[PDB]
């Protein structure tokens, strides 16, 4: 035989979206063609993020893209987000933007158009730029989900700040024994 172990002989990476959305699959077909027939890896990254699930493409806020496009050098570029561009209310002045996203909320798009921006989908983004030249690829905070507060080193352990699963935060709920140096021990 062979001295080969098959623990990791199969890659776990995706090859297609797990959704039956026909519009998404049509965009997948377009970028599949672009990725396999162009030398630019931007299409390949967009194709990967298209394959990714809902939680792997968190909704990028308006504030993040404003701060990231405000960086010097990337003037009048094309901000491309594979996820969703959501309105952020803690901002007053919105500069002119070049936004390419799968979907934008009803008032965020109104705010950008009022500010003088332009929202274009991926089908017209391909026509504007096949290889994605003159574009900045942005992603939302993937660790921003509240579930990540519960992950990592276990709670009730020294040097471990992990949120415990408590049915109701309060005085009587998981506060006495493992949390205090008086009632036994504290970590």
């Amino acid at each position: 035989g062979v001295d080969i172990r098959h623990n990791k002989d199969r890659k776990v990476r995706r090859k297609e979206p797990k959704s039956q959305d026909i519009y998404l699959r049509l965009l997948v077909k377009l970028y599949r063609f672009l990725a396999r027939r162009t030398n630019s890896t931007f299409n390949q990254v967009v194709l990967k993020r298209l394959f990714m699930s809902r939680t792997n493409r968190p909704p990028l806020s308006l504030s993040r893209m404003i701060r990231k496009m405000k960086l010097p050098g990337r003037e009048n570029k094309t901000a491309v987000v594979v996820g969703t561009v959501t309105d952020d209310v803690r901002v007053q002045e919105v500069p002119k933007l070049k936004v390419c996203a799968l979907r934008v909320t009803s008032r965020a798009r109104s705010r950008i158009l009022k500010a003088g921006g332009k929202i274009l989908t991926f089908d017209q983004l391909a026509l504007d730029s096949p290889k994605g030249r003159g574009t900045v690829l942005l992603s939302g905070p993937r660790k921003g989900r509240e579930v990540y507060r519960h992950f990592g080193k276990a709670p009730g352990t020294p040097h471990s700040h992990t949120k415990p699963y408590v049915r109701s935060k309060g005085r009587k709920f998981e506060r006495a024994r493992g949390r205090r140096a008086s009632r036994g021990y504290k970590n």
Partner: protein, 105 residues
């Protein structure tokens, strides 16, 4: 035998809850019954308002809701006597009256 990580739960199912359980399979039927009784009442009092008598302006007691104004139980006797409306005729003409309401304002 709790699992690795998760909440601690105290469900209140240790009694014989199946013996006393109420199901809402009659919810639409009860809605229709209320609607028919309401319409029958409305046509019974042909010119009178469907909602009934008139209730006064009232703001909620607690601190959480002292900035909101709701509907009252009835008009106070002091308010009625200022308005010159008798306590026995107010209900006849369709004015809600409850003698327990005070007026500290």
């Amino acid at each position: 035998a709790p699992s690795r990580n998760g909440m601690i739960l105290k469900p209140h199912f240790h009694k014989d809850w199946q013996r006393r359980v109420a199901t809402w399979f009659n919810q639409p039927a009860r809605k229709i019954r209320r609607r028919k009784a309401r319409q029958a009442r409305a046509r019974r009092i042909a010119p009178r308002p469907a909602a009934g008598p008139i209730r006064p302006i009232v703001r909620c007691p607690t601190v959480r809701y002292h900035t909101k104004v709701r509907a009252g139980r009835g008009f106070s006797l002091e308010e009625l006597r200022v308005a010159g409306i008798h306590k026995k005729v107010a209900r006849t003409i369709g004015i809600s009256v409850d003698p327990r309401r005070r007026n500290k304002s």
